[PDB]
C-alpha cells in the first residue's frame, strides 16, 4: 500500500469531524500500545526501506535528520538485544513523533506515478 | 521554399530565399565511391588545393569565401558571395575550373598541400575515434565495393599520389554530364542562369564517366582493439535504404524512435525512449546515436556508441538489440507519433538552417540522384502518413534475423563475438 | 534451396512445429522399421511358424 | 598495412547469387536436429516411465 | 589476506559461517534454521546406517525393522532417533515457519527465500510419508493407499497415475520397494534445496525482530552466533534424548506395530500428528475432488502472503491487531490438528469446517484488511491536518 493512498484515506478521516473525533482517539491508543516510542523510535524509522521509493526518500533526507535516524535505529537494536526498554525520560514524546520522512516519500511516489503515466500515454488524432 | 531546376547545356539548380548572402558552386556526381583502392584520396586532395593559400587569397581579395565537401556519391566546390557579387563568384569558378585547373597543380603548391592532407588524415586516424569507427563500419560493411572507400582516403594511397592522378580523375569525372551548378542564398534562378548562358564554350561535352560494379552489404566486422584508449567506441548496422527508396522515410523514422543520447545532459536522460530505462541503471554508456545513412546504391541503419563501462558492453549491445526487436513485433502508436514530431523538427533544422552552403550541399546531392528536390512540406506529408504497420513491415525485412556489420576501437575486449551479437537480431517464439 | 523458403520463409522452424513433427515422426518411423525388420526375418518369426501349425 | 584494406575472404564467401542459401541450409539442419532430439527425448522419457508400470510377472488373472 | 578468505573452499565457509554480518539484535527464534540443518543430518546419518540392515520386500520389510530393533547393536537407538527425529524435524520447521510469518520474513526482498522454503516443506512432507510406508505396519499400508489415491481425483487420467505409482493392482511389493528407493533419494534433493535456500539468504542477510534495517550494526557470525547456536543445539538434543530413551513411542501409533493387512483397515487409524491439520482440512469438504484441492491449497496459500500483507512495516512487533490475529491463526492451527485426531462426529465436523475457513481467511481476508487499517491508524495518530 502506497503512502499516497494512506494519506488519501487518513486525510479524509482527519477533516470530517464525525470520523476525526471517533477514530483519532482509537489511533492514539493503538500507537501507545505499539510500543516503539519506548525503544526511542519514531514511526517513520519503522518504514521498510528495501525498495526504490524509500531509497530515493532516504537519499534526499537532510544530513542532520539522517544522522539522527541512524542513532535512533542503533540505539533501538542495542536496547532490544538487552531485553530492556529505555529510561522513560528517553522515550520519544508524541510532539517528537513527527512524519519527518513522509514528505520525501510522497514526493517520490508522485514523481514515479507520473513517469509510469507518461511512459504509457496513448494518443488520439 | 522553392525548387527551380532547368537544363541549358549544363544543368542549373537554385533555391532562393531573402536571407543575406548567396552561395554558388558546382557539384559533381562522383565522389570517393568512384575512386580505386590505389588512388583513394584523390578527391580529398582536389578539395584541398581548391582551398589552398594561393587560390584562397585570390578569392579573399575579391571578398569571396571558399568551401568544399567530399562525400561518397558526390563532390562539391562552393563559393559564397555578398549577394550582389553573384557574378564575381561565377568568375572565380571558371577562372579555376578552366584557366587555373592547370595552374593550381604547380610543384610547390601540390607538395605543400599533400604534406597537409597527410598530417590531416593521420590526425584523424590517431584521434577521431567515433568517425574513425564509423568510417571503418562502411569499410567492412561494403568491403571490395565502392562504398567501402573512405572519403579522406588512406595514408598509403595518399602518399603515393601524383599530379597525373589528380589530372586523370579530373578528366574522367569533372565532366559536363557529371555536373550540376547550384545556387542558394537569395539570388533568383533567372539571375544566375543568364550569367551562365552568357558565356558558351562547353569543355569536354559528350564525354561520359566510367561505369563500375554495384555496391553490396556483407555481414562482417572489423575490431580495432586498443587497450590504451580510455573508452570503447562501437558502431553496428544492418543494410539500410538507398535514397529514392519507398522506405527512405520509414527507416529515418525508425532511427528517431531510439534517437540519440548523452548521459551528462539532464534533458537527455528524460526522453521518451524505452531503451533509457535499461541503460541508465548501471550507466551502460556515455552516449549513443542512431542513424539511417542513405546513398545511391545502398545505406546503413544502426547506431554508434561510446562507453567507459568496459565490463558491461554486452549489456549495452543486448538491451539495444532487444529494443530493435520490438520494431517488428510490438512498437506502439505513441512511439511512432513521438518519432514523427521529432523527425520533422530535425529534418526542418537541416533543410532550413541560416547557412546557404549547407543548402547548396543538400540541394546538390538531391538533384544529382533523382533530378529534383522533394520540398520540406512534401516530406512532412510522407512522414505523417507512416503507420505502425509500415514500421513493422520494414523492420521485419531489414532488422529481423538479418546480418549485421560491426566496427569498434578502444577497450572492446568485452564486446562479445559476432554470432552472439547476430543471434540478438531476433527472439525465441512458440 | 527454395523448398525451405516456401514453408518457413527465411525464418527458423519454431518449437511448436518441431514438437508436432516429432509426434508424426515417431509413428511413421516405427512402422517403417518394424515392417523392414519383420520382412527381413520372414520365415523365422512366430507369425510365420503359426501358419504351419493347427491344433 | 591500412586497416581500411580488408583482407581476402574470397575462398570462404559464397559467390552470392542466391542470398538465402546458407540460411536455408543452416535452418533446415537446426530444424532437423530439433525434430530428432525431441523424438529421442520423448522415447527416452517413455522408456523410463514405463519401467514403473506393472511387471510381466505380477499381472495375474485370479 | 587471511587464508580462510583466499582459499576457494574456505572462503565459502568464511562468508557463510565466520565473517557473515548478522544484525546484532536477532533473538533465539533465529536459531531454528541451524536446528533444521542438524535435523537433516540426523535423519540422513541414521537412515543410511539402518539401510544397511533393511529389506524393502513387502514380505520382509516389517521383520527387517524388528531385526534392527532386536539384533542390530544399538539398532533401537538408530530407529528411535530416526522416528522421533522426524517428529522433531516438523516441530522445528513449524516454528521456523511461524517465526517467518510473525516477523514478515516472507516480505520483499526475501520472497525467493520464502518460496524455496515452501518447496522444502512440501518435499519434507513427501519424504516422511515415504519413510513411514517403509515400516509396512498397518498405518504404513493404509497411509500408502490413501495418499497414492489422492491422485485418483485428477480428471480422466487419475486412476492411471495411481496404478502407475503402485506398479500394479494395489499397494504391493513393487510399491514398497520403489517407496524405499524414493525415500533414500529425496533427502538429497532437500539438501540441494537447502543450499539454494542459503544462497537466497546470503544476498540479503537475515531480518531482525524490529523489522527494520540491520545495516547500521552488524556483528560476525563467528563467536557470537556460533556459540549462541550451541545453546539451542544442546537443549534440542536433551529433549530429543528424553523421548528416544524414556518415551520412544509416545509420538507414534500402536497400529504400526502390526504388520500391514490388505483386507482390514483398523478402526483406530489416525494420521501422524504433524499431518493432522491438513487431514482435518481435507475431511471437512464432503467432496472427493474438492477435498484434495482444498488441502493442497492450504499449503500453496503460503505463497500469497507477500502480496496480501499490505502493511508498510515488516513484522508484527509493533502491531497490536496483527499480533492478536497471528495467535488466532496459531491456535486455530492447533485446533485443526485436534479435530484431525477426532471422530467424524457432530460437533467436530462443523468446528473443522469453521476452522478451515478461518485458516484461509487469515491469508486472503484478515491480513489484507487489518494491515490496511493499521497503516491508516499509524498515520492519523501523528498527522495534524
Ligand atoms: C529428511 C530426511 C528424512 C526424514 C524426514 C525421514 C523420515 C522417516 C520416517 C518418518 C520414517 C518412519 C519412522 C518409523 O519407523 O516410524 C522413516 C523410516 C526409514 N528411513 Fe527415513 N527419513 C529421512 C531420511 C532417510 C534417509 C536418507 C535414509 C537413508 C536410506 C532413510 C532410511 C530409512 C529407513 C531404512 C527407514 C525404515 C526404518 C524405520 O522405520 O525407522 N531415511 N524415515
Ligand atoms: C530443511 C529446512 C530448512 C532449513 C535447513 C532452513 C535454514 C535456514 C537458515 C539457516 C536460516 C537463517 C537462520 C534463521 O532465520 O533461522 C533460514 C532463514 C529463513 N528461512 Fe529457512 N530453512 C528451512 C526451511 C524453511 C521453510 C520451510 C521456510 C518457509 C516456508 C523457510 C523460510 C525462511 C525464511 C523466510 C528465512 C529468513 C528469516 C528472517 O531472516 O527473518 N525456511 N532458514
Ligand atoms: C545469515 O544467516 C545465517 C547463516 O547463513 C548461517 C549459515 C547460520 C548457521 C547455520 C547453518 C550453517 C546450517 C548449515 C547446514 C547445512 C546447509 C546442511 C545441509 C545438509 C546435509 C544433509 C549435509 C550433507 C550430508 C551427508 C551426505 C551425510 C554424510 C554421510 C556420511 C558420513 C555416512 C557415513 C557412514 C559410512 C558407513 C561410511 C545462521 O545461523 C544464520 O542465521 C543466524
Ligand atoms: C512418490 C510420492 C508420492 C506418491 C506422494 C507424495 C505426496 C503426497 C503429500 O504431500 C507431499 C501427502 C503426504 C499430503 O500432502 C498434502 C499429506 C498432508 C497427507 C495427509 C494425509 O495423511 C494421511 C495419513 O498419513 C494416514 O496414515 C494412516 C491416513 C490418512 O487417511 C486416513 C491420511 C489422509 O487422509 C491425509 C489427507
Short mmCIF file of N, CA and C in Angstrom, two decimals, chain A residues 1 3 6-7 9-11 13-15 23-24 26-28 30-31 33-36 39 41 43-50 69-70 73-74 76-78 80-81 83 97-99 102, chain E residues 23-25 27 107-110 208-217 309-314 317-321 323 371-385:
data_model
loop_
_atom_site.label_atom_id
_atom_site.label_comp_id
_atom_site.label_asym_id
_atom_site.label_seq_id
_atom_site.Cartn_x
_atom_site.Cartn_y
_atom_site.Cartn_z
N UNK A 1 0.85 -1.23 0.00
CA UNK A 1 0.00 0.00 0.00
C UNK A 1 0.86 1.25 0.00
N UNK A 3 1.99 5.24 0.30
CA UNK A 3 1.74 6.33 1.24
C UNK A 3 0.78 7.39 0.68
N UNK A 6 -2.50 5.88 1.78
CA UNK A 6 -2.70 6.00 3.22
C UNK A 6 -3.05 7.46 3.55
N UNK A 7 -2.43 8.40 2.84
CA UNK A 7 -2.65 9.83 3.07
C UNK A 7 -4.06 10.25 2.63
N UNK A 9 -6.91 8.29 2.44
CA UNK A 9 -7.84 7.79 3.46
C UNK A 9 -7.69 8.54 4.79
N UNK A 10 -6.45 8.76 5.21
CA UNK A 10 -6.21 9.37 6.51
C UNK A 10 -6.66 10.82 6.58
N UNK A 11 -6.44 11.57 5.51
CA UNK A 11 -6.80 12.98 5.48
C UNK A 11 -8.32 13.18 5.42
N UNK A 13 -10.46 11.22 6.81
CA UNK A 13 -10.91 10.98 8.17
C UNK A 13 -10.59 12.18 9.05
N UNK A 14 -9.43 12.78 8.84
CA UNK A 14 -8.92 13.84 9.70
C UNK A 14 -9.70 15.15 9.55
N UNK A 15 -10.31 15.36 8.38
CA UNK A 15 -11.05 16.58 8.10
C UNK A 15 -12.50 16.51 8.57
N UNK A 23 -12.12 8.37 15.50
CA UNK A 23 -11.00 7.49 15.16
C UNK A 23 -9.69 7.86 15.84
N UNK A 24 -9.34 9.15 15.82
CA UNK A 24 -8.05 9.61 16.33
C UNK A 24 -7.75 9.13 17.75
N UNK A 26 -8.88 6.29 19.01
CA UNK A 26 -8.53 4.89 18.78
C UNK A 26 -7.09 4.78 18.28
N UNK A 27 -6.76 5.58 17.27
CA UNK A 27 -5.42 5.60 16.68
C UNK A 27 -4.34 5.98 17.68
N UNK A 28 -4.63 6.95 18.54
CA UNK A 28 -3.69 7.40 19.56
C UNK A 28 -3.34 6.27 20.52
N UNK A 30 -3.75 2.98 19.89
CA UNK A 30 -3.03 1.98 19.11
C UNK A 30 -1.52 2.28 19.08
N UNK A 31 -1.18 3.55 18.87
CA UNK A 31 0.21 3.97 18.79
C UNK A 31 0.96 3.78 20.11
N UNK A 33 0.17 1.50 22.45
CA UNK A 33 0.27 0.06 22.66
C UNK A 33 1.35 -0.57 21.77
N UNK A 34 1.56 0.01 20.59
CA UNK A 34 2.60 -0.42 19.66
C UNK A 34 3.97 -0.51 20.35
N UNK A 35 4.31 0.54 21.11
CA UNK A 35 5.46 0.45 22.00
C UNK A 35 6.78 0.95 21.43
N UNK A 36 6.80 1.32 20.16
CA UNK A 36 8.05 1.70 19.51
C UNK A 36 8.70 2.95 20.11
N UNK A 39 11.30 2.33 22.78
CA UNK A 39 12.61 1.95 22.26
C UNK A 39 13.37 3.15 21.71
N UNK A 41 12.18 5.10 19.13
CA UNK A 41 11.93 5.22 17.70
C UNK A 41 10.79 6.17 17.40
N UNK A 43 7.83 6.67 14.35
CA UNK A 43 7.18 5.75 13.43
C UNK A 43 7.91 5.67 12.09
N UNK A 44 8.31 6.82 11.55
CA UNK A 44 8.94 6.86 10.23
C UNK A 44 10.26 6.08 10.19
N UNK A 45 10.88 5.85 11.35
CA UNK A 45 12.05 4.98 11.44
C UNK A 45 11.71 3.52 11.15
N UNK A 46 10.43 3.18 11.29
CA UNK A 46 9.93 1.81 11.17
C UNK A 46 9.58 1.38 9.74
N UNK A 47 9.50 2.34 8.82
CA UNK A 47 9.09 2.03 7.46
C UNK A 47 10.13 1.11 6.77
N UNK A 48 9.67 -0.01 6.21
CA UNK A 48 10.55 -0.90 5.44
C UNK A 48 11.22 -0.13 4.29
N UNK A 49 12.55 -0.19 4.24
CA UNK A 49 13.34 0.66 3.35
C UNK A 49 13.88 0.00 2.09
N UNK A 50 13.68 -1.31 1.94
CA UNK A 50 14.28 -2.05 0.84
C UNK A 50 13.45 -2.00 -0.44
N UNK A 69 18.34 9.63 12.64
CA UNK A 69 17.71 8.34 12.35
C UNK A 69 18.67 7.19 12.61
N UNK A 70 19.93 7.37 12.22
CA UNK A 70 20.97 6.35 12.39
C UNK A 70 21.20 6.02 13.86
N UNK A 73 18.01 4.20 15.39
CA UNK A 73 17.99 2.81 14.95
C UNK A 73 19.03 1.94 15.68
N UNK A 74 20.25 2.46 15.80
CA UNK A 74 21.30 1.72 16.51
C UNK A 74 20.94 1.56 17.98
N UNK A 76 17.94 1.55 19.26
CA UNK A 76 16.84 0.59 19.33
C UNK A 76 17.32 -0.87 19.29
N UNK A 77 18.28 -1.18 18.42
CA UNK A 77 18.81 -2.54 18.33
C UNK A 77 19.53 -2.97 19.60
N UNK A 78 20.34 -2.07 20.16
CA UNK A 78 21.06 -2.33 21.40
C UNK A 78 20.12 -2.56 22.57
N UNK A 80 16.87 -3.50 22.31
CA UNK A 80 16.19 -4.75 22.00
C UNK A 80 17.01 -5.97 22.45
N UNK A 81 18.31 -5.97 22.14
CA UNK A 81 19.14 -7.12 22.47
C UNK A 81 19.42 -7.28 23.97
N UNK A 83 17.01 -6.82 26.09
CA UNK A 83 15.65 -7.11 26.58
C UNK A 83 15.16 -6.10 27.60
N UNK A 97 7.25 12.66 17.67
CA UNK A 97 6.89 11.59 16.74
C UNK A 97 6.25 12.13 15.47
N UNK A 98 7.02 12.93 14.74
CA UNK A 98 6.58 13.65 13.54
C UNK A 98 6.81 12.79 12.30
N UNK A 99 5.95 12.92 11.28
CA UNK A 99 6.26 12.30 9.99
C UNK A 99 7.33 13.05 9.19
N UNK A 102 7.84 11.36 5.59
CA UNK A 102 6.63 11.33 4.77
C UNK A 102 6.63 12.26 3.55
N UNK E 23 22.67 -9.08 12.03
CA UNK E 23 22.08 -7.99 12.82
C UNK E 23 22.22 -8.31 14.30
N UNK E 24 22.67 -7.32 15.08
CA UNK E 24 23.05 -7.54 16.47
C UNK E 24 21.92 -8.06 17.32
N UNK E 25 20.69 -7.81 16.88
CA UNK E 25 19.54 -7.97 17.75
C UNK E 25 18.69 -9.21 17.49
N UNK E 27 17.01 -12.66 17.91
CA UNK E 27 16.79 -13.40 19.14
C UNK E 27 16.82 -14.90 18.87
N UNK E 107 8.53 -11.17 3.34
CA UNK E 107 8.43 -9.93 2.58
C UNK E 107 9.62 -9.71 1.68
N UNK E 108 9.41 -8.85 0.69
CA UNK E 108 10.47 -8.27 -0.13
C UNK E 108 11.57 -7.67 0.76
N UNK E 109 12.85 -7.98 0.48
CA UNK E 109 13.40 -8.68 -0.68
C UNK E 109 13.65 -10.18 -0.47
N UNK E 110 12.92 -10.80 0.44
CA UNK E 110 13.14 -12.20 0.76
C UNK E 110 12.04 -13.14 0.27
N UNK E 208 15.47 -9.02 11.30
CA UNK E 208 15.60 -8.95 12.76
C UNK E 208 14.25 -8.60 13.41
N UNK E 209 14.15 -8.71 14.74
CA UNK E 209 12.84 -8.56 15.40
C UNK E 209 12.19 -7.16 15.31
N UNK E 210 12.98 -6.14 15.00
CA UNK E 210 12.43 -4.80 14.85
C UNK E 210 11.81 -4.58 13.46
N UNK E 211 12.18 -5.44 12.50
CA UNK E 211 11.64 -5.35 11.16
C UNK E 211 12.28 -4.28 10.29
N UNK E 212 13.29 -3.62 10.83
CA UNK E 212 13.99 -2.58 10.08
C UNK E 212 15.40 -3.02 9.70
N UNK E 213 16.13 -2.14 9.02
CA UNK E 213 17.46 -2.44 8.52
C UNK E 213 18.43 -2.90 9.60
N UNK E 214 19.30 -3.84 9.21
CA UNK E 214 20.33 -4.35 10.10
C UNK E 214 21.69 -3.77 9.75
N UNK E 215 21.72 -2.90 8.75
CA UNK E 215 22.97 -2.44 8.14
C UNK E 215 23.83 -1.53 9.02
N UNK E 216 23.26 -0.98 10.08
CA UNK E 216 23.94 0.03 10.88
C UNK E 216 24.72 -0.58 12.04
N UNK E 217 24.46 -1.85 12.32
CA UNK E 217 25.10 -2.53 13.45
C UNK E 217 25.14 -4.06 13.24
N UNK E 309 -0.09 -9.03 2.40
CA UNK E 309 0.37 -8.19 3.50
C UNK E 309 0.60 -6.77 2.97
N UNK E 310 -0.33 -5.87 3.29
CA UNK E 310 -0.37 -4.54 2.68
C UNK E 310 0.38 -3.52 3.52
N UNK E 311 0.73 -3.92 4.74
CA UNK E 311 1.46 -3.05 5.65
C UNK E 311 2.68 -2.39 5.03
N UNK E 312 3.16 -1.37 5.71
CA UNK E 312 4.26 -0.57 5.21
C UNK E 312 5.50 -0.80 6.11
N UNK E 313 5.30 -1.58 7.18
CA UNK E 313 6.38 -2.04 8.05
C UNK E 313 6.43 -3.57 8.11
N UNK E 314 7.65 -4.10 8.19
CA UNK E 314 7.88 -5.54 8.21
C UNK E 314 7.70 -6.08 9.63
N UNK E 317 5.91 -6.89 15.49
CA UNK E 317 6.37 -6.45 16.81
C UNK E 317 5.65 -5.21 17.35
N UNK E 318 5.36 -4.26 16.47
CA UNK E 318 4.71 -3.03 16.89
C UNK E 318 3.29 -2.93 16.34
N UNK E 319 2.63 -4.07 16.19
CA UNK E 319 1.30 -4.11 15.59
C UNK E 319 0.31 -4.88 16.45
N UNK E 320 -0.55 -4.14 17.15
CA UNK E 320 -1.47 -4.71 18.12
C UNK E 320 -2.52 -5.66 17.52
N UNK E 321 -3.13 -5.28 16.41
CA UNK E 321 -4.16 -6.12 15.80
C UNK E 321 -3.56 -7.35 15.11
N UNK E 323 -0.72 -8.86 15.90
CA UNK E 323 -0.24 -9.82 16.90
C UNK E 323 -1.39 -10.71 17.36
N UNK E 371 -3.99 -5.07 7.97
CA UNK E 371 -2.75 -4.37 7.71
C UNK E 371 -3.02 -3.01 7.07
N UNK E 372 -4.07 -2.93 6.25
CA UNK E 372 -4.57 -1.65 5.76
C UNK E 372 -5.06 -0.73 6.89
N UNK E 373 -5.87 -1.27 7.80
CA UNK E 373 -6.37 -0.49 8.93
C UNK E 373 -5.21 0.03 9.78
N UNK E 374 -4.25 -0.85 10.08
CA UNK E 374 -3.09 -0.46 10.88
C UNK E 374 -2.24 0.61 10.18
N UNK E 375 -2.15 0.52 8.86
CA UNK E 375 -1.47 1.57 8.07
C UNK E 375 -2.08 2.93 8.35
N UNK E 376 -3.41 3.00 8.29
CA UNK E 376 -4.15 4.24 8.45
C UNK E 376 -4.11 4.73 9.90
N UNK E 377 -4.19 3.80 10.84
CA UNK E 377 -4.13 4.15 12.26
C UNK E 377 -2.79 4.80 12.62
N UNK E 378 -1.69 4.25 12.08
CA UNK E 378 -0.35 4.81 12.29
C UNK E 378 -0.26 6.25 11.79
N UNK E 379 -0.95 6.53 10.68
CA UNK E 379 -0.94 7.85 10.06
C UNK E 379 -1.72 8.93 10.83
N UNK E 380 -3.01 8.67 11.07
CA UNK E 380 -3.90 9.66 11.68
C UNK E 380 -3.59 9.88 13.16
N UNK E 381 -2.74 9.03 13.73
CA UNK E 381 -2.35 9.20 15.11
C UNK E 381 -1.22 10.19 15.32
N UNK E 382 -0.64 10.68 14.22
CA UNK E 382 0.51 11.58 14.30
C UNK E 382 0.37 12.83 13.43
N UNK E 383 -0.42 12.74 12.36
CA UNK E 383 -0.59 13.86 11.44
C UNK E 383 -1.70 14.81 11.90
N UNK E 384 -1.39 16.10 11.93
CA UNK E 384 -2.30 17.10 12.48
C UNK E 384 -2.86 18.04 11.42
N UNK E 385 -3.46 17.45 10.38
CA UNK E 385 -4.15 18.21 9.33
C UNK E 385 -4.90 17.25 8.41
#
